[PDB]
Amino acid sequence: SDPITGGHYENHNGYFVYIDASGKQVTGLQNIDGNLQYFDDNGYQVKGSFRDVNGKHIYFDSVTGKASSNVDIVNGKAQGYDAQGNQLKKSYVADSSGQTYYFDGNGQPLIGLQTIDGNLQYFNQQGVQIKGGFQDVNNKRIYFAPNTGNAVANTEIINGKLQGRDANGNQVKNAFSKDVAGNTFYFDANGVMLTGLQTISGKTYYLDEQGHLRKNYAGTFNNQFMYFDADTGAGKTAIEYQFDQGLVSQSNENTPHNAAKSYDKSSFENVDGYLTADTWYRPTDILKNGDTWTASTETDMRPLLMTWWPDKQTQANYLNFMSSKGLGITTTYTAATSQKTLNDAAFVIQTAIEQQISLKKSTEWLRDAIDSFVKTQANWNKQTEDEAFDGLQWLQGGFLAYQDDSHRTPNTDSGNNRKLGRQPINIDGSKDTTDGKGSEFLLANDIDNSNPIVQAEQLNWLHYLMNFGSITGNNDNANFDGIRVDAVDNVDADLLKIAGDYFKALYGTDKSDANANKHLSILEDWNGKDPQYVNQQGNAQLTMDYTVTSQFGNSLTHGANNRSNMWYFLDTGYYLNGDLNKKIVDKNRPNSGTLVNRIANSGDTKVIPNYSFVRAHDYDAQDPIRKAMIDHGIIKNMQDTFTFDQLAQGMEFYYKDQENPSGFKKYNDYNLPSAYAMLLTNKDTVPRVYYGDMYLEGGQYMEKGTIYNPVISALLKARIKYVSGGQTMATDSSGKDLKDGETDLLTSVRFGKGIMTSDQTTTQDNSQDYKNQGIGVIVGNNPDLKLNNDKTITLHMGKAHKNQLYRALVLSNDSGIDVYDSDDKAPTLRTNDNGDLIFHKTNTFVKQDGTIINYEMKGSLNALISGYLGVWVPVGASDSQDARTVATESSSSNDGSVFHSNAALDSNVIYEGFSNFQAMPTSPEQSTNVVIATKANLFKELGITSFELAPQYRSSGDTNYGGMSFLDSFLNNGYAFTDRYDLGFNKADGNPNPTKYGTDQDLRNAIEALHKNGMQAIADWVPDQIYALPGKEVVTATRVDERGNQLKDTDFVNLLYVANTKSSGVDYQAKYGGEFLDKLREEYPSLFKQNQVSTGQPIDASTKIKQWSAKYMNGTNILHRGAYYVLKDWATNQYFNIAKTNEVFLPLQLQNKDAQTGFISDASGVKYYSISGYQAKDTFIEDGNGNWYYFDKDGYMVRSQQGENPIRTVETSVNTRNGNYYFMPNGVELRKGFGTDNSGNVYYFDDQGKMVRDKYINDDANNFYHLNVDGTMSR
Amino acid sequence: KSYVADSSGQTYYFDGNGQPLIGLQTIDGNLQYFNQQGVQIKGGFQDVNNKRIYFAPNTGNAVANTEIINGKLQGRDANGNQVKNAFSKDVAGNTFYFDANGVMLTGLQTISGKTYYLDEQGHLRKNYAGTFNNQFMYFDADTGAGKT
Amino acid sequence: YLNFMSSKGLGITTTYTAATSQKTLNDAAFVIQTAIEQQISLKKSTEWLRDAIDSFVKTQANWNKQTEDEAFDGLQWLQG
Ligand SMILES: OC[C@H]1O[C@H](O[C@H]2[C@H](O)[C@@H](O)[C@@H](O)O[C@@H]2CO)[C@H](O)[C@@H](O)[C@@H]1O
Ligand SMILES: OC[C@H]1O[C@H](O)[C@H](O)[C@@H](O)[C@@H]1O
Ligand SMILES: OC[C@H]1O[C@H](O)[C@H](O)[C@@H](O)[C@@H]1O
Ligand SMILES: OC[C@H]1O[C@H](O)[C@H](O)[C@@H](O)[C@@H]1O
Ligand SMILES: [Ca+2]
């Protein structure tokens, strides 16, 4: 059947009905939103029963009522049916009880023993499949598997002894047989399971006390060591050396030809002196065309991997890969292949290479072949980087922290800076060991804001933005007024003080509220303990108030059906025993509740100044918009890259869902008008309004208003006219649960300019402004809310408004929300003697002149609401009425603080005026900042006092040097940028080069336009990171989580890595970097002398940052390059280098010396030489058959002696590998198995050979073992 | 474009190019997931993406399941979302009901105008006769709903 | 019976159940009886019907081994 959408589900008499978009009750088979359902003739939905439509016999599910497969006992005999209702042939079907039948070619179920797809199965006389049990079919007895039902070997206990049964149902005699768990046993001639050490068929196996065959198990069995095979469990003496490579010399007739022309940067492609897997070098001679050796010319570069390899495994892989590209006999080579053979094979490939270079007259084909091959190898890709997605790692796949390592990577040393996670609550590091350490790593290249030099540069940038117009256009009216601090908890909290003190010095923000409020500044500070920090520090920037944003989520904004009560908005716990009668403040609660109590807020108790919002560019936007794209198959993952066209298509579904007349929302938020009604009437907050609630989040800037625009616009204008004075808030509710009459409808009131209380009748200053001010707001979260006929709902407009006429601004109903622009067009209602507006289930209102109106207090459901909303204002409001308070020039407070929550601060409204998912401008005329200039007027009249612009920085775009791209970057929203000072300047050739938002002139025009209309402009200050730096350096890196803590089980610790950390040095960061600091030090010395908390030091302007590099970074997101992309010799663990001729280290082949490689015995023990010709000391080495060995400081393999403990404690240059290992007599390290010591104690050794302590360990056969603290196994 | 099980009984799915699939995948209309190794999981919960999901012991298919957190059981659906205000199964075959809180409901419960009987363990009882309201009630074999 | 004979061209092919009204089944049995007498005149034989009845009868559980509890354990192995 054809699908339908936009009809609600209703329940009558215990049954689901579905009412169409048409408004018609539905009968018959119906595909509703991709689910196939049925309704009988009364309109009820069928669940857990079969129905007959057309030729089909269709079952519907017992929970959902959705069409699915079942077996029906049609007439006498069972018959299978699919989801579409077709009788099934030659197919399995499971019925409602989870029982399985197989129906044959005629549709009739098979009974008895059967073979299906090579699987033996049994069926009872009713056709049902036996699963997970024995069964006596014929002479035999057969066990059948739990889920497949396939015949399998199993053991059962007959009498008191275990017995073995095979797959054919025959008992096992003189043989090995398994059980379902996975354990192997052996059963003798008499049928009885064997135990202990047993020799059968010339081989010895060890069976434990339980009779389990033990594989990969070491122990002294014959009073002599014995290792039991991983494959079959058969005992080897482990006396024979398993390495297959003797010491061999590699030098031959080609060595001097392929050796390096020079041991320096001329002849070797490199990074900071080091070599990489894809390094090309200049050989002394070149086998041109594969015929004749000729001296090389400077341009004749060849890949290092043509001639050298880190190990035989890599060499073999190189040979196999290049072979596959037509370069020689296609080969299966292994690390086990002899070194000589691999080298000979590499030369026939070299010959072939030189032939295709002559044939193509190009080397680009080879660059691509090498690049591709290199990425194949685990050590040269992300497989050795430990990609993880938990926590902030979710964004880009994981982080590396750079290290101070003056010996190997001195340019990258930070000078003992890089203090990580100095967020506000951990500004002094005193929570470094707990979760209270800040998540310093977020995105891209994380800047080291704990470094004084970098702190000074952030101030330079800050100055540049606050004087952007002066500096870039000599236009003193085109300057930003205030800032938003991006990612506060992901940076060193000193930046707050630096910014605060700058504003104090330059604008005297600590002097008056007028000064402070002229430079409105906000924080993106998510941590729940940030508000109290910010307030202790004097509120230099306004904290967000997540507690109210949160409660909107729970009670209104999130979820179609189940929501927290509106009661929770009150936070009655604020008062002792929620005594709303007694109102005694609770001096000592468990660090909980909403930031500002509004139950009876008369402005008498000091509160923390704040901004608050319902949504943001980065809250309830990014996830829904992507879930919508995922849901319609446009992308697969949240991290996945999408194109702008892909975004546009998804946006169409997002919009369809948002404006859905059904009233249901899958991705979008519910009750946004109702949420704004509360946000915009709340005392003691600077509300912020999200562009995307006013206009559509995609496409062009201001292209099309949202359905919420009228209501929010009305609320905003009404806020100018009526919102002042004290507040009260109550609910028809006392807690989680509602008594009989209770509605849980919230009533929020404001009184007028000087009126602070319910019972206050007049102002102290005898101003009359109050009489036509004030507002009443009623809101619910229940669309199915019906009042009792008894019930009355009251707005206590206050005793300053006795007998006054009030008129509606906004009233909800079943098709939308009506908006009333002026007193004449709206229904009036008059307050009583005590000043209460009384409401009933049914109301008859009269217009002041026009007519009589009917209205029910009814929860409604439509695109604009899921609940109730009523807003009422006093009639008689002047056209120019302004209830706002101007900020006072006087030094009102000696507290030292900048912002103060009061009527003046509350008179402000911030507009967050962009969306991250805007389309790119189709023309210069439609660029955001051009549009803002033409439309400035419109925001003045909505009461916006500060305009929060998007970050104006040039997007890093599609640029991607490694690792996962982020949406900020490819959507060009300005949060991901390469140059911090480029805000849309022209290309150097003179051509325009706008950001997503327009040119730099367009920005200055936009900012001026806002000042011409009395609004401020907010700059997005983004100090935490920078993207896509084009220059490479070699850092020392450790793999870390968001807090900069080393991952628990990582090998990636202090390794050399190639990162992209260096800026172009010829960009706007080079022009303007540090330039304004000297002028500033001269003019305000104390800024440069004042100590910061986290460092104990003042900012350092002695060094200017014209070019970024690794020393000023904490780290980066993993770049998918590999743990050992920077080439290293396994034997000595030293990295190759060619920077200075006095400290060169190269493989000996490349210097035309003789490189010997392999294992060689001597009277003392075994030694090993790497492919580069150096002896292994204090290092682990892996042979060509995959076995691992440790070579001690003296250069000798560690091996166990008879009668001595095989377990050895290893302390190596590579620290991560430290631990206790188990080395066998032939030096092989035991891995992923148990090992007995000389005294009979059992230990376990992990994937990498380390002993495991103090935990339970599980087995593939479901055996559990326990390891004590000292390592021993209690089991 | 085929499944293969290796010697250890671990399963990979190789695509059109012979390269194994990784992450969340739909195959023959079945939702699954393969690890960084490239081997699919069986009878386990992997926290892939935003929410946790149980995997079929032999089929590896996404299925509703319930796991124990603290002392109180929870329900997870086939899409990996926790279940609120709904019935959900576990791998053994028992049905439970979960409220807004997610606590498994117990005893006689009336939801959506129908009455179901959940035993001490929270199992929905089908084809069960008993005097529930002091009055006889037979609970449906199909859905467990009480008829008189 | 009605469904089986219907399948052999003796009338409208029917899905009838035990739930079908007795009246409807009896009416349907007579239209099948009519059809039967026509094929007896057409063929001048009743052997075709003997074979049809024999086949139908074995279809029914009460008239075949399904109600006889076939088992093969012990000497029952030989003949069921
Ligand atoms: O297509 C369903 C299922 O097929 C495979 O399961 C195999 C299993 O891997 C083999 O060892 C074996 O026992 O036969 C089973 C059924 O074919 C895939 O391994 C699995 O991922 C997939 O769900
Ligand atoms: O669909 C796969 C499986 O579903 C079920 O678990 C049935 O018990 C089983 O027989 C079937 O193979
Ligand atoms: O020792 C007497 C008997 O013992 C066990 O039953 C053996 O399985 C059987 O072969 C032997 O005849
Ligand atoms: O998200 C806030 C929630 O925190 C915990 O879940 C509380 O138990 C709950 O009452 C509250 O609503
Ligand atoms: Ca940071």
3-state helix/strand/coil string of A163-221? EEECCCCCECCCEEEECCCCCEEEECCCCCECCEEEEECCEEEEECCCCCECCCEEEEC
Instruction: Classify strands A1016-1021 and A946-948 as parallel, antiparallel or unpaired.
Output: parallel
Report how far apart the first and last C-alpha atoms of chain B are (Å, whole number). Answer: 54
* Contacts for A1044 with CB less than 8 Å, ≥ 6 apart: A399, A401, A420, A421, A437, A440, A441, A1114, A1115
Is any atom of ligand 2 closer than 6 Å to the C-beta of B59? yes
Q: What is the 3-state secondary structure (H, E, C) of A229-248?
A: CCCCCEEECCCCCCCCCECE
Name the residue range of residue A626's domain.
547-907
Q: CB of A190 closer than 6 A to ligand 3? A: yes
* Proximal ligand: closest to the CA of A547: 4
User: Distance, CA A794 to ligand 2 centroid (Å)?
Assistant: 60
Query: What chain A residue is nearest to C18 in terms of C-alpha separation?
Result: A75
Euclidean distance between CA atoms A448 and A1084, whole angstroms:
25
Q: Which DSSP state fits A730?
A: E
Are B58 and A148 in contact (CB < 8 Å)? yes
- Locate the DSSP E strands across chain B: 2-5, 11-14, 23-27, 30-34, 45-46, 53-54, 65-69, 72-76, 86-89, 95-98, 107-111, 114-118, 128-131, 136-139, 146-147
Cβ count near A537 (within 10 Å) = 19
The CA distance from A427 to A420, in Å, is: 10
Residue A15 with chain B: CB contacts under 8 Å: 113
Residue nearest to atom 9 of ligand 2 (CA): A147
**Residue A440 annotated in ligand binding:** yes
- Let me know the angle formed at the C-alpha of C21 by C19 and C26, rounded to the nearest 5 degrees: 120
Ligand number nearest to the C-alpha of B63: 2
Query: Is there a binding annotation on residue A446?
Result: yes
Tracing tokens 């060991």 back to the chain, one arrives at: A433
| CA B102 to centroid of ligand 4, rounded, Å | 12
Q: CA A573, CA A588: separation in Å to the nearest integer?
A: 11
Residue whose C-alpha is closest to residue A188's, from A179, A176, A180 = A176
Q: How far apart are CA A888 and CA A509, in angstroms?
A: 12
CB pairs under 8 A between A and C: 11
Residue A575 tokens read as 């008062």
The whole-angstrom separation of Cα A1274 and Cα A294 is 70
Q: CATH number of the domain at A573, please.
A: 3.20.20.470
| DSSP symbol at A843 | E
Type of residue numbered A194: L
Chain A contact probe: residue of B87, B143, B148 with most A CBs at under 10 A: B143
Contacts of residue A1149, defined as CB under 8 A and 6 or more positions apart, other chains included, come to A250, A251, A255, A258, A259, A307, A308, A1155, A1172, A1173
A1075 is in an annotated binding site: no
Angle between helices C47-59 and C22-43 (to 10 degrees): 150
Is C74 buried (19+), middle (13-18) or exposed (0-12) by CB count in 10 A?
A: exposed
- With CA atoms as reference, the chain C residue closest to A57 would be C15
Atom of ligand 2 nearest to the CA of A99: 8
Cross-chain residue pair B112–A14, CB shorter than 8 Å: yes
Cβ–Cβ under 8 Å, residues C14 and C21: no
Asked how this structure was determined, the answer is X-ray
d(CA A1020, CA A1006): 15
List of chains touching A (3+ CB pairs within 8 A): B, C
Contacts of C3 in chain A (CB under 8 A): 75
Closest CA to A549 of A595, A487, A495: A595
Instruction: For chain A, give the number of residues.
Output: 1275
SS3 A1219: strand
Task: Give the CA diameter of chain B.
Answer: 66
Residues 6+ apart with CB under 8 A from A925: none
CB A1118 within 8 A of CB A396: yes
Resolution in A: 3.1
Residues 6+ apart with CB under 8 A from A790: A741
Residue B125 to chain A, least CA–CA distance (Å): 12
Q: Are A360 and A377 in contact (CB under 8 A)?
A: no
Both tokens of residue A1186? 């995959």
DSSP H helices in A554-665: 622-631, 644-658
